[PDB]
């Protein structure tokens, strides 16, 4: 009454065992398939690149076939190759210069970090709120870094765009098309702005504009404080600059050689001093020898008498 | 905590997804009574076929109790102990919606739970007949070590099945690439078929292959050059900034006053925050887009008709928007235009731009002068290294020291002279 109950549960359980092990085998086979497909995908990407290449080669040939012959084309090519070699040199010089500049900025920044450490130790010793100084300072530096980052990115974009513009001056058709697309971009931006404007109720617009003039007036206040603070720093810097170049007045021209000559006179005298002592001892011992010979003459004559 | 609004939205969405129905919120809210019971019943009929019930014709009390035992015991949810089965017998939304929410949330656990419930349990037989005949006792030993096999291979299979990823997207990418290659080889067949009748064939193609490689290296060198130039400029600028920071560090060290330092810091923080909040990200974005649109203009061929149509369309649309903003400036009920505040904001805006550019001009001259200070500091350090000049009261002390050296040598000189004159008088004493 229970054995006829064991039998079906046992076969059902074993059937799911079989299913689980078949799924295990499937997972392993799928794993090896995935490892194979990764290699196949890399190989196909590279072959696709090469295929695009020879396609481009043939299409350039189709272009140049009407107006040029293999000779002139290869001449254009070697000409451009020689230019690219010189350009390679220019660009490597730029690489080096920039690497130097960056190294200098790293040293300037390490320098500044040292003077920060000594000042912040100074105020921490004076038992002021150091946490607030470090906090507002970190925020100030981060926003500044942010501004420098954005300005960098814009300069970059604009320069590369100048490259794009020069490329588009090849075809007069795409040159006029590029300037028209420039206009399209500007019009897109203006539409965006005007549509933002007209999508609010004139009462909501006046509320927003009133808030805007409030915040603008507050900004103008903080701006005028900054203008005065930098006029102060600017005055300070100009006095430091005149102070320094007059400190520089004292090294120009004859002054440097005058000190050089006094140095040389020092070294002469010290050489002569170092020459003194050994010769002094030598002459001393010579004089003692001649007085000893005085004694020799005297006592030898005395011994002659006996 | 979710409002009954959010709960109803979740219930309707996931009931629609699981049962592929398209109930609207009203329509689902309209489902009370046995029909709501059968909603939950069909949820459980997606989990276990045994649970598929018709509530339309079934003993609602006994079936609702059967459901409750299913939801409590196998799925594992419990709560109001005395009222729960009585009110769950009723199609009480105040009890049903939280249950629908719980089941539609933990749906994956319900799947796993019903799988184990089908396989693991429902034996607690006493050993009496098991101790009577050892034959079925060994059959039961077979059953229990089969269950041991089952848990071993199941945890192993589940851990490895989650460990290895699905190669569906990978085979899709691989087949797309194969089709792409086949299309390219066809394109190339067309190309080399069009290039068959050329005068010199491999000559021209090798020449052009070389020219093309020359052009690509040309353009890459141009771009890396531009990149290196700008990256220089920017590293320079960061140095100038470092100098500005140094100036501010010495000025702030002047007033040990942390508070005033923080006040001026905050004033510059928000002056930067002025341009970093919108104006610079907007200029950045516009340049990024302008460059992207020109890259796409050079990569593809041009159908200037499409852009000329975008031009005329934008012309007309801006005409609409200008007339609309103009009629927004029509005097209202007071006689007051919006333009009055428009002129106030224009006037304040010109003031802010004027002061802000004054600020930046000053800041430029500070950075310039400040670079020059570093230039002069550097050459003065180069001279103080190349030499070791004094030119101070140190110069006078050095000069006094050298004069003393001269006098000292003369003194030593007369010392040796006196010693020598005594040597001479000894030589003459010897002469006698």
What CATH number did the domain enclosing B63 receive? 1.10.418.70
Instruction: Say which DSSP state A92 is in.
Output: H
Instruction: Report d(CA B123, CA A174) in Å as an integer.
Output: 82
Residue range of the domain that includes B68: 4-123
DSSP state of A128: S
**CA of B422 vs chain A CAs: smallest distance (Å):** 8
Q: Taking a C-beta distance cutoff of 8 angstroms, is the pair A182, B290 a contact?
A: yes
Residues 6+ apart with CB under 8 A from B197: none
Chain A interface disruption, residue of B232, B294, B371, B402, most A CBs within 10 A: B294
Instruction: Please report which helix (H) or strand (E) contains residue A293, including its range.
Output: helix A254-305
Q: Residue with structure tokens 């490689």? A: B213
Q: Other CB atoms closer than 10 Å to residue B88's CB: what's the count?
A: 21
Q: What is the resolution of this structure in A?
A: 3.2
Residues of A in contact with B379 (CB under 8 A): 248
Cα(A26)–Cα(A179) distance, integer angstroms: 59
Q: Are B15 and B104 in contact (CB under 8 A)?
A: yes
Q: In terms of Cα–Cα distance, which of A257, A268, A112, A111 is closest to B383?
A: A257
d(CA B195, CA A54) in angstroms, rounded, equals 13
d(CA B233, CA B235): 6
Ramachandran angles phi, psi of A23, nearest 5°? -65, -35
Return d(Cα A113, Cα A34) in angstroms, integer. 51
Count Cβ atoms within 10 A of the Cβ of residue B371 and give its class: 0-12 exposed, 13-18 middle, 19 or more buried.
Answer: middle
Partner-chain contact A280 B416, CB within 8 Å: yes
Contact B184 A55 (CB under 8 A): yes
Please classify residue A184 by burial: count the beta carbons closer than 10 Å to its beta carbon, then call 0-12 exposed, 13-18 middle and 19+ buried: middle
Q: Which residue has the tokens 């003065």?
A: B380
Task: Please give the DSSP secondary-structure letter assigned to residue A306.
Answer: -
Nearest-CB residue to A34 (from B170, B199, B427) = B170
Tokens, residue A102: 């960056």
Q: How many residues does chain A have?
A: 306
HEC secondary structure over chain B: CCCHHHHHHHHHHHHHHHHCCCCCHHHHHCCCCHHHHHHHHHHHHHHCHHHCCCCCCCCHHHHHHHHHHHHHHHCCCCCCCCHHHHHHHCCCHHHHHHHHHHHHHCHHHHHHHHHHHHHCCCCCCCCHHHHHCHHHHHHHHHHHHHHHHHHHHHHHHHHHHHHCCCCHHHHHHHHHHHHHHHHHHHHHHHHHHHCCCCCCHHHHHHHHHHHHHHHHHHHHHHHHHHHHHHHHHHHHHHHHHHHHHHHHHHHHHHCCCHHHHHHHHHHHHHHHHHHHHHHHHHHHHHHHHHHHHHHHHHHCCCCHHHHHHHHHHHHHHHHHHHHHHHHHCCCCCCCCCCHHHHHHHHHHHHHHHHHHHHHHHHHHHHHHHHHHHHHHHHHHHHHHHHCCCCCCHHHHHHHHHHHHHHHHHHHHHHHHHHHHHHHHHHHHHHHC
Handedness of CA B91, B95, B98, B102 (dihedral sign): negative
Is the separation of the CB atoms in B294 and A158 below 8 Å? no
CA A82 to chain centre: 31
Nearest Cα to Cα of residue B322 among A183, A210, A187: A187
**And the tokens for B30?**
């309209």
Q: How many CB atoms lie within 10 A of CB B183?
A: 12
Report whether A168 contacts B299 (CB < 8 A): no
CA distance A189 to B367: 35
Residues of chain B neighbouring A290 (CB-CB closer than 8 A): 423, 426-427, 430
Inter-chain touch B226–A160, beta carbons under 8 Å: yes
Which residues have CB under 8 Å from B286's CB, separation 6+?
A185, A189
Exposed/middle/buried for residue A70 (C-beta within 10 Å: 0-12, 13-18, 19+): buried
Distance from CA of B63 to the nearest CA of A (A): 26
Which residues of chain A make contact with B369, given a CB cutoff of 8 A? 234, 237-238, 241
Decide: B353 and A222 in contact? Cβ < 8 Å: no
- B402 vs A269: CB contact, 8 Å cut-off? yes
Question: How far is the CA of B326 from the CAs of A199, A201, A213, B49, B349, in angstroms?
Answer: 14, 14, 21, 68, 21
Pairwise CA distance, residues A6 & A1, whole Å: 10
Q: In whole angstroms, give the CA distance from residue B167 to residue A38.
A: 10
Q: What is chain A's Cα-based Rg?
A: 45
CB B21 within 8 A of CB B15: yes
Can you read off the two tokens belonging to residue B238?
């960061």
Q: CB-CB: which of B199, B287, B389 is closest to A259?
A: B389
Q: Are B307 and A57 in contact (CB < 8 Å)?
A: no
CA distance linking residue A263 with residue A285, whole number of Å: 35
H or E element: which one contains A126? none
Q: How many CA atoms lie within 13 A of B181 on its CB side?
A: 17
What's the token pair of residue B19? 């049962």
Cα B199 to chain centroid, rounded: 56
Give the pair of three-digit tokens for residue B322: 């200008």
Residues of chain B with C-beta less than 8 angstroms from the C-beta of A273? 405, 408-409, 412
**Domain locations along chain A:** 1-66, 172-199
Chain A CB contacts of B385 below 8 Å: none
A155 touches chain B (CB under 8 A): yes
Residues in Cβ contact with A33 at an 8 Å cutoff, skipping those fewer than 6 apart: B167
Count Cβ atoms within 10 A of the Cβ of residue B234 and give its class: 0-12 exposed, 13-18 middle, 19 or more buried.
Answer: buried
Task: Look up residue A48 and give its two tokens.
Answer: 């696709």
DSSP summary character for residue A199: T
Residues of B in Cβ contact (< 8 Å) with A77: 207, 210-211, 214
| Separation between Cα atoms, residue B242 and residue B138, nearest integer Å | 85
Distance, CA of B271 to CA of B262 (rounded, Å): 14
Query: C-alpha distances in angstroms, A58 versus A73, A236, B214?
Result: 13, 67, 15
Instruction: Tell if the CB–CB gap between B416 and A283 is shorter than 8 Å.
Output: yes
Q: Whole-angstrom distance between the N-terminal and C-terminal Cα of chain B? A: 132
Residues of B in contact with A141 (CB under 8 A): 245
Q: Among A143, A106, A137, which residue's Cα sits nearest to residue B238?
A: A106
Minimal CA–CA distance to B262: which of A140, A13, A32? A140
Query: Cα–Cα distance between B224 and A91 in angstroms, integer?
Result: 7
Q: Residues in chain B, how many? A: 432
Contacts of B65 (CB under 8 A, 6+ apart): B85, B89
Residue environment code for A224-239, b if the CB has 16+ CB neighbours within 10 A, otherwise e? eebbebbeebbebbbe
What is the phi-psi region of residue B57: left when phi exceeds 0, alpha when psi lies from -120 to 50, beta otherwise?
Answer: beta
Where is chain B discontinuous (C–N over 2.5 Å), named by the preceding residue?
Answer: 79
Residues 8-27 of A with CB under 8 A from B: 9-10, 13-14, 16-17, 20-21, 23-24, 27
* Among A116, A148, A241, beta carbon nearest to B237: A148
What whole-number distance in Å separates Cα of residue B352 and Cα of residue A216?
A: 7
Hey, what are A263's tokens? 């140095």
B405 contacts on A by Cβ (under 8 Å): 266, 269-270, 273
Residue whose pair of structure tokens reads 């031009």 in the numeric block: B311
DSSP class of A169: T
Residue pair A108/B374 in contact by the 8 Å Cβ criterion: no
Nearest-Cα distance to chain A for B330, in Å, is 11
CB A184 within 8 A of CB B314: yes
CB contact under 8 A, A256 and B387: yes
Contact criterion met (CB < 8 Å) for A57 and B208 = yes
Torsion angle of the four alpha carbons A30, A36, A37, A43, in this order, in degrees rounded to the nearest 10: 180
For residue B22, which phi and psi values (nearest 5 degrees)? -125, 45
Find the helix or strand (DSSP H, E) in which A256 lies: helix A254-305
- Closest approach of A146 to chain B, Cα-based (Å): 7
- Distance (Å) from the alpha carbon of A303 to chain B's nearest alpha carbon: 17
Give the position of tokens 């490329």.
A167
Phi-psi region of B165 (alpha: psi -120 to 50; beta: other; left: phi over 0): beta
Is there a contact between B249 and A115 if contact means CB atoms under 8 Å apart?
Answer: yes
- Please state, in angstroms and rounded to a whole number, the distance separating the CA atoms of residues B264 and B252: 9
C-alpha to C-alpha distance for B121 and B147, rounded to whole angstroms: 10
Sign of CA dihedral B154, B158, B164, B166: positive
**Which of B194, B198, B228, B425 is the best substitution to test chain A (most A C-beta atoms within 10 A)?**
B228
């Amino acid at each position: 009454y229970y054995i006829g109950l064991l039998r079906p549960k046992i076969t059902e359980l074993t059937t799911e065992i079989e299913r689980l092990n078949e799924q295990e085998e499937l997972i392993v086979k799928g794993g090896s398939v995935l490892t194979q497909l990764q290699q196949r995908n890399k190989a196909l990407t590279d072959e696709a690149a090469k295929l695009k290449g020879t396609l481009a080669d043939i299409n350039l040939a189709l272009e140049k076939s009407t107006t040029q012959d293999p000779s002139s084309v290869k001449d254009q090519a070697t000409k451009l190759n020689q230019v690219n070699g010189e350009k390679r040199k220019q660009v490597d010089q730029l690489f080096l210069n920039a690497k130097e500049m960056e190294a200098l900025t790293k040293k300037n920044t390490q320098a500044l970090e040292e003077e920060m450490q000594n000042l912040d130790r100074r105020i921490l010793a004076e038992n002021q709120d150091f946490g607030l100084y470090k906090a507002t300072r970190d925020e100030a530096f981060n926003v500044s870094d942010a501004v420098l980052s954005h300005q960098h990115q814009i300069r970059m974009l604009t320069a590369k765009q100048e490259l794009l513009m020069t490329k588009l001056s090849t075809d007069p058709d795409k040159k006029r098309a590029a300037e028209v697309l420039r206009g399209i971009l500007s019009k897109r931006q203006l539409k965006e702005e005007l549509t933002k404007q007209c999508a609010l109720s004139v009462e909501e617009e006046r509320q927003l504009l009133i808030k805007q003039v409030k915040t603008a007036r507050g900004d103008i206040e903080v701006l005028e404080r900054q203008v005065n603070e930098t006029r102060d720093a600017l005055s300070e810097s100009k006095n430091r600059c005149a102070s320094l170049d007059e400190e520089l007045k004292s090294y120009s021209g004859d002054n440097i050689k005058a000190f050089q000559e006094l140095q040389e006179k020092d070294r002469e005298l010290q050489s002569f001093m170092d020459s003194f002592p050994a010769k002094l001892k030598e002459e001393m011992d010579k004089i003692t020898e001649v007085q000893r010979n005085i004694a020799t003459l005297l006592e030898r004559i005395s011994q002659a008498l006996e | 905590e979710p409002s009954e609004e959010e709960v109803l939205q979740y219930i309707v969405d996931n009931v629609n997804k699981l049962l592929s129905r398209h109930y609207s919120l009203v329509e689902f809210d309209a489902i009370q009574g046995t029909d709501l019971l059968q909603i939950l019943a069909d949820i459980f009929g997606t989990l276990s076929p045994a649970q598929q019930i018709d509530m339309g014709v079934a003993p609602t009390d006994e079936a609702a109790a059967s459901m409750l035992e299913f939801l409590t015991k196998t799925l594992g949810y419990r709560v109001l102990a005395d009222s729960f089965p009585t009110s769950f017998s009723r199609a009480e939304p105040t009890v049903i919606y939280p249950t629908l929410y719980w089941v539609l949330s933990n749906m994956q656990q319900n799947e796993k739970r019903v799988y184990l419930a089908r396989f693991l349990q429902r034996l607690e037989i006493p050993e009496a007949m098991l101790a009577q005949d050892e034959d079925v006792r060994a059959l039961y030993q077979q059953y229990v070590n089969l269950r041991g096999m089952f848990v071993n291979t199941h945890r192993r299979v589940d851990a490895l099945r989650t460990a290895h990823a699905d190669p569906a997207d990978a085979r899709r990418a691989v087949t797309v690439l194969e089709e792409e290659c086949d299309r390219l080889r066809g394109y190339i067949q067309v190309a080399e078929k069009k290039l068959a009748g050329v005068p010199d064939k491999e000559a021209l193609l090798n020449a052009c292959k070389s020219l093309r490689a020359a052009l690509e290296e040309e353009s890459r060198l141009a771009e890396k050059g531009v990149e290196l130039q700008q990256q220089l400029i920017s590293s320079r600028q960061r140095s100038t900034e470092m100098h500005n920071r140094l100036q501010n560090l010495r000025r702030d060290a002047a007033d040990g006053r942390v508070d005033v330092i923080v006040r001026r810091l905050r004033d510059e923080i928000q002056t930067n925050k002025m341009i970093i909040e919108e104006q610079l990200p907007k200029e950045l974005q516009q340049k990024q887009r302008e460059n992207a649109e020109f890259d796409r203009l050079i990569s593809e061929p041009l159908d200037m008709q499409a852009l000329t149509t975008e031009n005329q369309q934008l012309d007309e649309a801006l005409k609409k928007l200008h007339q609309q903003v103009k009629e927004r400036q029509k005097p209202g009920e007071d006689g007051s235009t919006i333009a009055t505040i428009k002129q106030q904001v224009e006037r304040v805006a010109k003031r802010k731009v004027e002061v802000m550019e004054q600020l930046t001009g000053l800041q430029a001259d500070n950075s310039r002068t400040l670079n020059d200070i570093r230039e002069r500091e550097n050459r003065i350090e180069q001279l103080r290294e190349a030499h070791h000049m004094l030119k101070d009261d140190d110069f006078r002390e050095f000069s006094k020291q050298v004069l003393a050296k001269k006098a000292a040598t003369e003194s030593m000189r007369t010392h040796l002279s006196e010693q020598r004159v005594e040597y001479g008088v000894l030589n003459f004493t010897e002469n006698v």
